[PDB]
Design a binder for these strands. Sequence first.
DNA 1: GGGGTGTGGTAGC
DNA 2: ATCGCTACCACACCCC
Length: 438
Amino acid sequence: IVACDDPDFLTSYFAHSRLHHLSAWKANLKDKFLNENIHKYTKITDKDTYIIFHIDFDCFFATVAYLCRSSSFSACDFKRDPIVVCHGTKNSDIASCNYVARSYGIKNGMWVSQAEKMLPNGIKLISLPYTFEQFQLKSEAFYSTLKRLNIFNLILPISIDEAVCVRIIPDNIHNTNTLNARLCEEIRQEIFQGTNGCTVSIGCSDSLVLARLALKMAKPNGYNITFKSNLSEEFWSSFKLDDLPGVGHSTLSRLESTFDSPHSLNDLRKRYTLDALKASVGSKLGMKIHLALQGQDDEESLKILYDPKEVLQRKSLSIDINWGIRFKNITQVDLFIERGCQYLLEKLNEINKTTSQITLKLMRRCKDAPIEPPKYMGMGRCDSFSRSSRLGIPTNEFGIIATEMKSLYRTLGCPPMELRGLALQFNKLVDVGPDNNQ
DNA sequence: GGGGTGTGGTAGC
DNA sequence: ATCGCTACCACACCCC
Ligand SMILES: Nc1ccn([C@H]2C[C@H](O)[C@@H](COP(=O)(O)OP(=O)(O)OP(=O)(O)O)O2)c(=O)n1
Ligand SMILES: [Mn+2]
Ligand SMILES: [Mn+2]
Ligand SMILES: [Mn+2]
Ligand SMILES: [Mn+2]
């Protein structure tokens, strides 16, 4: 057990945090793409007609943790038992749950205690531990398989369990559903073999947005090919508004208020005007949703196809620790800030950059919120405060950065005992060139 | 037009 | 117990 004022806290927390693992795995994949392709020109041009294959593991953590489960879980059955991956037993996040669990209404991100309430009597939840190294190894097999197939011009990492793979069609070749179906089945079988039993589903389309919707329709353990010329009422009727890219809870709430509570993308499609859409959720989001409902990508989304190196290039660097923050005095806060800056500068030096602007964000307990929230060591109900500072010269100097980070904390005026979370950020990154005579 | 700030939402999730 | 991370875009509103 490692408390936040222990030097080992950052290491222990990140070792246990599945969300830290997801973010670090994604950042590593982005860096590997940029280094694999230092010379290879990977971009899609306007001359290219392309097909998108959006490929994603089915309940990734749950599948892998089950396949690699310890002897205590030998009799566990993946197709018959509701299985979750989590740390705890009560207010612990379900990182992933299998499709049996989902048939009862359980979802990723729910708390274990919330999920147990949805099971009828006689049905018990099986909770498996995290297997972080195996998650990474199966993802390696996944990405290696996608390359070995030699069928994609461009393989874009989306996450540990997910990639956008692009196939350019020569104007002389006649693409067919049958050819796409066989590619989907090849990919699914080769990854199933290469991962020793994990399944992926595949959305296949001529837009990024349709491939994402096709993928959702394909799941679990299937594929779906839906081109813009294949669009239909049956297709749109199969999705909730939440399924549209760019629509999270806050946008969903606004769309439900503005358009008489639609219950499918087919509902929304028939009720919306572009202008009321923009008014409800915002101008750029409203235009994105408008295009998405026609099967079409927006300018912002297409950038990853036409300039992936620029898109996947890292422009900021940060850490966020909003769990286990319980400090008694400012000396201990300041030491934690120093440890966080040391960790971030180690990353900054690994990528051979300097930073010219930094940000500190904190979570502060709301005045009438309990000192100890429902979730053990949780941040609880808070408000956020951030403040940033431009540095004189771009720097990688600990003394400058840590001093300014501690000044930003001082500026924000949060009593140490009220602190519930900290984020430390390097906002603008500058390359270190061969010439440093200044 | 150009620049900036802190806040908020969502993509990974 | 329990491990609620990270990057980027968009916005409202300020400067000149
Ligand atoms: N709230 C969440 C959502 C996802 N994940 C982790 C666990 C997932 O297994 C993994 C991949 O995320 P996905 O969105 O791809 O979800 P799954 O792979 O679990 O299920 P599926 O994609 O079949 O819906 O990311 C998490 O930790 N917390
Ligand atoms: Mn998945
Ligand atoms: Mn995924
Ligand atoms: Mn959504
Ligand atoms: Mn997902």
